[PDB]
Amino acid sequence: SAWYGPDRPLFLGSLSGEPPSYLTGEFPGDYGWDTAGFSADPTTFARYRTIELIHARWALLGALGIITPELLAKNGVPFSEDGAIWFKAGAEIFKEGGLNYLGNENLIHAQSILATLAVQVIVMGAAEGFRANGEAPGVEGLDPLYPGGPFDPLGLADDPEAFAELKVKEIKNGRLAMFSCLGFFVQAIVTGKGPIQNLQDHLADPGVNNAFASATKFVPTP
Amino acid sequence: LVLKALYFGGVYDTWAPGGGDVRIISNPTTNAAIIFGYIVKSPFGGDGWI
Amino acid sequence: MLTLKIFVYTVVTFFVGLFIFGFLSNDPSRNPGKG
Amino acid sequence: TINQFYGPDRNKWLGPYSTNTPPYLTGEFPGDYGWDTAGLSADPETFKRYRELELIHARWALLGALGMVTPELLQDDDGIMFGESAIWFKAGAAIFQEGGLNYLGNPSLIHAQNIVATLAVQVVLMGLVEGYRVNGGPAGEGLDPLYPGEAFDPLGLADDPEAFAELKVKEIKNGRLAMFACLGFFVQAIVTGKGPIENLTDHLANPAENNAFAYATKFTPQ
Amino acid sequence: EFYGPDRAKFLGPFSENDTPEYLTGEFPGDYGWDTAGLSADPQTFARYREIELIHARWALLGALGILTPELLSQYAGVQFGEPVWFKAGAQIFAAGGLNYLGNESLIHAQSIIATLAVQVVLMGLAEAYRANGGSEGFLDDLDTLYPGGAFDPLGLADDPDTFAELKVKEIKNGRLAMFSCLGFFVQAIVTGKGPVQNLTDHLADPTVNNAFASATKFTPG
Amino acid sequence: LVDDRMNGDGTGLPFGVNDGILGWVIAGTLGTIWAIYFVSQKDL
Amino acid sequence: PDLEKWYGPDRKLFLPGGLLDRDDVPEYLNGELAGDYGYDPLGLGKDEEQVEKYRANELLHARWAMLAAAGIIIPEGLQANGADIKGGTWFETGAEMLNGGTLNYFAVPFGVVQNPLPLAAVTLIEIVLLGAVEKFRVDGTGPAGFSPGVGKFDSDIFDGLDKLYPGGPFDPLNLADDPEVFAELQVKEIKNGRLAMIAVLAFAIQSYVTGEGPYANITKHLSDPFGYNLLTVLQGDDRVPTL
Ligand code: CHL
Ligand code: CHL
Ligand code: CHL
Ligand code: CHL
Ligand code: CLA
């Protein structure tokens, strides 16, 4: 329903006013929300756009990888006490049993955090270096923000109409994922429990077991 | 109906001790799990749906 | 015997899903009439 | 008169030791002391966005400071008209009292007990207000984003614009003092645990020791 | 090297093409790292350059200032009240005050308000003169970033090729200093002990005394 | 107890679900049928 | 805008289309006044001059009864909720300070303050104030004053001003320069005032019937609707059950 152009939906509904001039609806996820003038020149608008989409994809992965192991732990998969809650999952590799995938001894069973970090550093260094320059040994020229090709094996992005609607879906889902990831970060600090645990605690008695029940735990004391 | 059972004389409770009485409803069970477990219940014996 | 219940639940859900989404699959356009 | 604040010979951010004022701060807006040494307002549209943002921040912080000062000032001797709620950073717990929060000691004012209901009403009203501010509504349609002055200036005041400019500068510096005092209130809340008026009285009790240096070792990691 | 389109860059070959057009290598320290586009504008690039250089000098001074008292507590047994850097500011609050090397006749400072007042007045004047770049004839010139005049007494401000090379050396050393100072700030919070003593603890056994050992300190309950 | 039973009679089990695997196969079957229906859209 | 339902020949009437066709509406009600519903069961409208002369009194009654209804319902509610009013009930408010026990004025949100004025002084200044006010109303002359709308207006501002709708000093917030919004706000004012006169009459008759204030009436009615209403208070005391 007109996801681009001048008649795009905006970030305040009918009370949005005049959108900024630099936001013409050329790019996906344009709701006209720039109240601080960050995107005055299009170069930093491009840098902020690629940073936003990279953060969006990383947050989709993060939200899925935060929800899924805890749901599996509550549904039967043996995550003992720290592998379930994501903010203590990093402490799982320091036990004698180590980091086991799905609680299986034969799966992964990692104990060297140094080796894990070194492998992650070199692999992500190669991957982000290939992403940064736009050239890889196996692919020559693509859109540095929307590559496709080897990254699109099923080929859902062929015609511009569905490519644009799927781009809007991607950026909006990533924005929801970033919002939920910030929610996870604040919920872990404030409540000290997992996200699914906070949700189930909210479902028991939402009138009193909400965020306002934890508003008096950060009060300074003289 | 909710206001009638809460603040306007209550409703007749047959489960009140002694044989039932006109009771004022206090602390209605607003928990979604137990409320909708009636809805997703089987309609056979022992469950009876709603 | 839990496996039998899981299998029966899967088959029932499969057939009920075909029914529901087949009737969602624009059933009035399978009209042999005009309109 | 007006040349002290709206010209090349205006007041600066270092006095006589500031000749390198940025060229895009010629001076035609309230304030404009030349303090853009980090250069976040090089783009004129970014500059106007930040100016509008700063004026809104100032107008919020004036009310914020006067609302953080007033109930502590209006506290009586025995403290029966205010419980812990006289201190600004523990006033929210006034909604969780046995009778809710009353505006004063007598219970006939406000007497609200549902934090969720008052929050929902507050969000709805503030959303309508901010939408009218950024778009235009009953109070105005195409007025200035900072100075509408039609339905928001009923007492007249803004005559002879050579003095209205001085009044604008009065507003922006009072708001700057308010934001500075609001930051002071926040940092005092973090480290002392007492209200700002209590901190003022304790500083006047003995200024040789009762200051921030008495709390300089609070966050020492042990 | 460190200048021009063939300059060394912040991702090696991985940054040979995707480099900002405004980062042409004319100014030292240019490795092409502006992936956020914070200095796309030339005036904000100049302001951020000045901010970065002042931060570089300040953190070089700081990194030499919060290490040398602890190394003097090490080695040749120089005694202080508390050689730890993040617990040094409280030494004025002690009965013996603050002394430079423990000698009672060296500093013996007890008035924290007076030392704050003299410091703020003195270097408020100094930073006002730095931002102004002189006032009515007295050093009323120079770029307020590389003054040289009455600031390079030994006369190393000559031979512009090696001057630019030394500028590259300075900005790289300052970037290392700010990275190390951020490391000092983070280690102080997560351990509560001195940096060189953390180094000594790491040298005893690197497989146990590492940052991962204190990674569970800030977990929420 | 001479023999093993599920003991699922009564108790108000949601959709008669006693183990989470049952609800998960309900969700999976409905979701994959919905996914096939959703991918096979814009027809006729 | 949207003046096609409160003005003109096709407008909202006191009876719908089936009840009241437009033919038997009186010929002097052509939808040019605010709040014209064509309501004339009895012959009191006469002609246009008569209906505007009576509209003068209607508007005065409306603007008085709005303040009357608010000043009846507010202090009794405050006294019932816990304010120190001592006389929030409207039909016994005057009798409190008969012998010098002067009332307390409650200027929210910072009220509770004594009024050190006797009844003779209060009624004397009230007469010498509102007699001058009504003399200014029926003559259209004011000496001098300052208003937020027009600043430091002289005596030559009330001449030529519309009767019953004098703009300027009485319109500091304006929002009446546009004639369409002015007309719809006029019909809003006359409808609110008619509701207020009805409410004040209800207050008086309710007080006469039950002996307590309207706030007490509404609170007890929401506490027990079937157990407390007009038929309950007219029963006198309880009722013999029909068992
Ligand atoms: C985005 C990445 C990322 C995040 C958010 C975390 C978060 C966490 N790790 Mg961790 N890790 C991450 C990556 C990695 N970790 C490890 C290896 C470990 C180990 C071995 C351990 C942890 C532990 C912890 C927790 C420490 C408790 C704490 O600080 O609580 C307060 C903080 C929070 C509750 C959440 C804070 C969210 C928000 C403020 C973060 C904002 C962004 C960050 C600045 C991250 C920036 C990343 C950039 C540089 C790429 C914590 C929730 C420890 C643990 O489980 O302790 C119980 C632990 O033992 N991590 C590796 C190597 C494989 C990583 C590689 O990428
Ligand atoms: C004549 C000398 C003169 C000097 C030196 C200054 C200096 C200053 N003026 Mg200023 N002014 C001067 C004259 C004049 N001013 C003004 C009008 C204004 C205005 C209107 C404003 C200023 C402001 C400022 C400040 C701007 C920069 C800043 O924020 O730095 C930051 C300062 C520092 C970093 C100093 C820190 C010192 C340090 C010892 C403090 C303690 C550190 C802690 C121990 C650490 C705490 C954290 C740790 C624990 C993690 C600055 C300190 C601005 C300001 O900030 O106002 C509040 C401002 O808004 N001036 C006028 C009238 C025309 C002047 C006339 O002569
Ligand atoms: C700018 C707005 C704002 C601020 C700063 C606060 C601050 C606070 N509220 Mg709060 N509230 C605010 C708005 C609202 N509150 C409530 C409802 C409540 C309740 C019901 C309660 C609080 C409580 C608290 C306190 C939490 C305990 C504490 O000391 O924490 C540490 C914080 C400080 C010591 C103060 C310094 C804060 C500063 C560092 C942060 C400034 C930036 C902010 C993050 C704001 C960001 C933008 C906003 C829009 C999100 C705290 C001082 C609780 C309380 O008082 O318990 C005794 C409590 O029970 N609030 C509502 C709904 C009506 C609000 C609506 O706008
Ligand atoms: C860049 C400057 C600077 C920094 C980083 C510090 C840091 C510190 N000083 Mg300090 N000071 C500084 C300047 C000055 N101090 C003092 C006078 C004192 C006294 C009298 C005392 C301290 C103390 C402390 C410590 C507070 C306890 C703690 O653990 O806090 C939390 C620590 C951290 C969170 C980590 C370190 C801070 C880091 C995050 C800084 C990041 C940048 C800052 C935001 C800079 C802000 C100010 C700038 C703009 C001027 C702390 C590590 C106290 C102490 O030693 O207690 C044992 C103490 O008693 N300082 C003066 C005046 C002579 C200063 C400058 O003129
Ligand atoms: C970038 C986002 C992100 C991040 C940072 C993490 C991070 C983490 N995840 Mg997670 N996850 C994510 C996204 C993410 N996940 C998403 C999107 C999903 C949904 C699919 C999951 C689902 C998931 C599950 C189910 C589990 C984790 C687990 C973990 C933790 C340990 C991972 C591990 O065991 O090694 C890395 C894992 C792999 C490399 C894949 C596992 C492959 C298994 C062993 C199958 C073996 C393949 C094959 C048969 C054998 C290979 C043969 C070989 C010789 C070629 C770790 C902290 C585990 C945990 O302990 O919970 C905290 C856990 O069980 N994640």
Ligand code: CLA
């Ligand atoms: C299904 C309900 C319903 C609906 C949708 C309508 C709709 C309409 N009626 Mg109508 N009417 C109804 C019920 C309804 N009526 C009933 C029960 C009566 C008997 C009193 C009437 C008697 C009636 C007459 C005599 C006339 C209309 C007329 C009209 C038409 C326009 C004028 C008008 O709105 O009159 C307004 C009606 C009233 C002011 C009556 C008071 C209604 C108030 C608002 C009650 C508040 C509702 C509240 C929830 C209580 C409901 C009780 C509930 C528990 C059952 C309009 C299309 C007129 C017409 O036909 O045009 C030529 C006309 O002359 N109606």
Ligand SMILES: CC1=C[C@H](O)CC(C)(C)[C@H]1/C=C/C(C)=C/C=C/C(C)=C/C=C/C=C(C)/C=C/C=C(C)/C=C/C1=C(C)C[C@H](O)CC1(C)C
């Ligand atoms: C637009 C605008 C305009 C205006 O005007 C201005 C402004 C205001 C500026 C704006 C806004 C902005 C914003 C909102 C921002 C935000 C962001 C975010 C939230 C991000 C996140 C983001 C987030 C993210 C990424 C996240 C991620 C996550 C992750 C990775 C996770 C991971 C994990 C997991 C899985 C699990 C395991 O076990 C562990 C871990 C490892 C932990």
Ligand SMILES: CC1=C[C@H](O)CC(C)(C)[C@H]1/C=C/C(C)=C/C=C/C(C)=C/C=C/C=C(C)/C=C/C=C(C)/C=C/C1=C(C)C[C@H](O)CC1(C)C
């Ligand atoms: C200029 C420049 C230039 C260069 O170069 C660079 C730079 C540095 C960037 C710059 C600077 C800047 C600055 C200074 C900033 C700051 C700001 C602030 C402080 C704000 C605040 C601001 C502040 C604010 C708003 C505040 C507000 C407040 C409030 C609301 C409060 C409220 C309240 C009250 C009443 C009471 C109760 O009980 C509680 C509450 C409810 C809570």
Ligand SMILES: CC1=C[C@H](O)CC(C)(C)[C@H]1/C=C/C(C)=C/C=C/C(C)=C/C=C/C=C(C)/C=C/C=C(C)/C=C/C1=C(C)C[C@H](O)CC1(C)C
């Ligand atoms: C390039 C780029 C590009 C992209 O795209 C974007 C971005 C991301 C933005 C980027 C990056 C950035 C960065 C890295 C930053 C950082 C910085 C730093 C670290 C600083 C520090 C800095 C640092 C510093 C100054 C420091 C300083 C220090 C000091 C003074 C010290 C002092 C002291 C002493 C001696 C003594 C005593 O007893 C203690 C104390 C008091 C403590």
